[PDB]
Amino acid sequence: SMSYTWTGALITPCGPEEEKLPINPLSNSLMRFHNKVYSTTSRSASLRAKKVTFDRVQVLDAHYDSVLQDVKRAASKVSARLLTVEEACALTPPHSAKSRYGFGAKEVRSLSRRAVNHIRSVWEDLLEDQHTPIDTTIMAKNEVFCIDPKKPARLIVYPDLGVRVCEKMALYDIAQKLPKAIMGPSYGFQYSPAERVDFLLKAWGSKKDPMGFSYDTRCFDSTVTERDIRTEESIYQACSLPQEARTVIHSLTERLYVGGPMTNSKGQSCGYRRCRASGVFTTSMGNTMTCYIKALAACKAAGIVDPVMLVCGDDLVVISESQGNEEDERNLRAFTEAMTRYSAPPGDLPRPEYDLELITSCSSNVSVALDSRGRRRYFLTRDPTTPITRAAWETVRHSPVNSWLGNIIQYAPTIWVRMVIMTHFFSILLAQDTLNQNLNFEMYGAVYSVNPLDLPAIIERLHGLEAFSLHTYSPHELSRVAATLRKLGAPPLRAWKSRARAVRASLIAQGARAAICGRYLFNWAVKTKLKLTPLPEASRLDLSGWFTVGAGGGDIYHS
Numbered sequence: 001s002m003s004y005t006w007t008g009a010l011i012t013p014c015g016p017e018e019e020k021l022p023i024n025p026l027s028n029s030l031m032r033f034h035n036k037v038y039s040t041t042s043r044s045a046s047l048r049a050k051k052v053t054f055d056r057v058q059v060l061d062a063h064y065d066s067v068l069q070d071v072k073r074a075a076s077k078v079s080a081r082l083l084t085v086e087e088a089c090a091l092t093p094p095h096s097a098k099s100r101y102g103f104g105a106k107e108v109r110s111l112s113r114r115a116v117n118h119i120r121s122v123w124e125d126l127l128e129d130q131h132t133p134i135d136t137t138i139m140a141k142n143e144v145f146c147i148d149p150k151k152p153a154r155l156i157v158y159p160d161l162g163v164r165v166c167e168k169m170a171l172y173d174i175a176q177k178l179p180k181a182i183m184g185p186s187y188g189f190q191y192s193p194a195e196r197v198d199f200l201l202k203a204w205g206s207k208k209d210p211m212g213f214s215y216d217t218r219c220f221d222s223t224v225t226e227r228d229i230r231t232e233e234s235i236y237q238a239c240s241l242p243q244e245a246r247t248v249i250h251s252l253t254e255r256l257y258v259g260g261p262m263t264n265s266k267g268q269s270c271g272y273r274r275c276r277a278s279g280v281f282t283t284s285m286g287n288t289m290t291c292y293i294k295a296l297a298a299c300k301a302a303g304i305v306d307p308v309m310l311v312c313g314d315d316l317v318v319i320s321e322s323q324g325n326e327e328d329e330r331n332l333r334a335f336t337e338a339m340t341r342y343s344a345p346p347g348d349l350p351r352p353e354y355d356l357e358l359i360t361s362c363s364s365n366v367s368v369a370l371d372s373r374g375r376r377r378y379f380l381t382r383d384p385t386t387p388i389t390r391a392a393w394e395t396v397r398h399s400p401v402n403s404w405l406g407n408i409i410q411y412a413p414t415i416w417v418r419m420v421i422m423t424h425f426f427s428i429l430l431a432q433d434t435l436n437q438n439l440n441f442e443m444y445g446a447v448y449s450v451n452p453l454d455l456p457a458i459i460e461r462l463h464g465l466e467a468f469s470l471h472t473y474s475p476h477e478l479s480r481v482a483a484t485l486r487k488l489g490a491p492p493l494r495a496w497k498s499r500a501r502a503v504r505a506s507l508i509a510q511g512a513r514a515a516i517c518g519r520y521l522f523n524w525a526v527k528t529k530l531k532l533t534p535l536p537e538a539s540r541l542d543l544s545g546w547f548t549v550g551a552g553g554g555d556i557y558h559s
């Protein structure tokens with residue numbers, strides 16, 4: 001069946017859409033080549049529609065069947081419950097898209113009677129009607145990139161806010177337990193950055209002759225079939241659940257997850273979906289489970305030897321024993337053929353990699369540096385082009401969700417975060433006198449709230465004290481950072497050091513928590529380095545809840 005059909009009505013914008021980065025001294029100081037920066041808009045939505053629209057023809061086999069049987073068996077050990085309305089309301093992000101029934105996220109979070117009564121009506125209707133397709137809106141995402149020597153907007157398909165709160169009531173608890181129960185250490189969202197690094201390193205080290213590859217599924221959401229989605233339901237139903245939950249889960253599956261009508265921002269019928277919805281609660285969990293099942297089966301089909309997989313939604317990395325250079329190539333082609341039969345054909349063809357630093361999982365890779373005691377330390381990093389470009393845009397057009405803050409937390413040990421991002425934004429915070437203000441940010445498909453003054457303890461907790469003293473880094477790493485600074489027209493690293501000396505000084509003179517930020521975050525910037533001791537708050541922080549499966553569209557909030 002076709003992943004989508006289309007009436008010919010356009011994918012329309014809500015309000016205005018800025019395409020280009022403005023020329024402004026506060027962003028220009030970070031990077032000069034503003035003409036290279038663009039935000040996607042609804043103008044390119046028809047180009048994306050063409051790419052995501054195709055027929056799927058899935059053929060399953062015994063390798064698939066046995067993996068699925070193991071998965072359902074594992075799922076049987078899980079017990080889950082319904083959330084109360086109040087609990088689901090608290091999980092709603094403050095800037096979630098408003099309902100068309102006369103309330104928005106603010107009213108959900110405050111438990112306004114209109115919002116709660118509406119949500120109760122939606123829940124009752126899900127108990128009563130297990131079949132009528134539920135309406136969705138289709139929008140073009142506005143996301144910022146640098147031109148690569150312009151990509152079309154991604155599309156997002158989501159139901160009304162009343163429905164989204166109900167999805168959490170039915171499935172949030174399952175989503176906290178099921179992926180780990182069925183995948184164990186292959187479930188990637190359980191790991192903080194350091195934990196991901198440790199898992200990859202140990203997997204790599206466990207092989208005599210390691211070989212790794214990443215598999216890029218072409219438009220994964222579109223390749224998910226109606227049957228894949230019903231199979232996901234059967235995995236949820238293998239858990240021990242209250243009957244009320246079982247009913248609503250089946251209704252959500254039949255009316256929303258397997259497909260439905262799509263409406264544009266103007267209220268015009270736009271198309272019909274028979275694939276994964278990109279903006280539902282289950283998008284991340286479902287993609288993870290289904291990717292895992294297809295991938296592990298394909299490893300068996302291809303003859304991949306002793307696979308260790310890391311799966312994060314549609315993102316897949318597999319580390320195994322090399323069978324020789326020719327044979328590895330043969331085996332990946334066979335892996336690809338099997339994935340293709342399972343309805344997950346490739347974009348980029350997979351290729352065998354024999355150096356861990358060059359393997360990319362979730363646009364990230366492991367690299368190495370030295371700490372202040374001269375010990376080797378490994379850490380997660382990535383190509384800094386997109387983070388810096390988004391930092392520049394968000395400097396002049398503030399976003400409810402601050403990408404730069406999530407990049408600080410996730411990539412704190414990196415040279416590019418420490419020298420450029422931290423320097424740029426702590427300067428801005430001092431200038432606004434808003435150091436002490438909580439800001440929201442995305443992380444693994446969820447939204448969180450952090451006070452910049454707590455960053456030192458947050459970073460020590462996630463990355464260790466070594467995050468404040470890494471040096472020496474690798475040439476791969478430094479080459480990539482240098483190439484990005486040149487491409488964007490950013491000041492060179494030596495200029496960022498000059499700036500950071502001043503930001504550190506200003507932070508220390510503010511005293512209290514600001515001074516801790518100066519001393520710890522910017523110790524790299526001074527000649528006479530301070531001896532950094534463990535921060536007592538760091539040793540008492542519980543940040544496990546930051547690394548969960550998240551939700552389609554990042555539509556979940558923890559506080």
Ligand SMILES: O=C1c2cccc3c(NCCO)ccc(c23)C(=O)N1c1cccc(Br)c1
Nearest residue numbers: 415418419470471472478482493494497524
């Ligand atoms: O402070 C610098 C630095 C300052 C100026 C230029 C460079 C540099 N430039 C050469 C080519 O871009 C390469 C690495 C570092 C660096 C470099 O690794 N460090 C550095 C040392 C310790 C911690 C941190 Br964070 C950065």
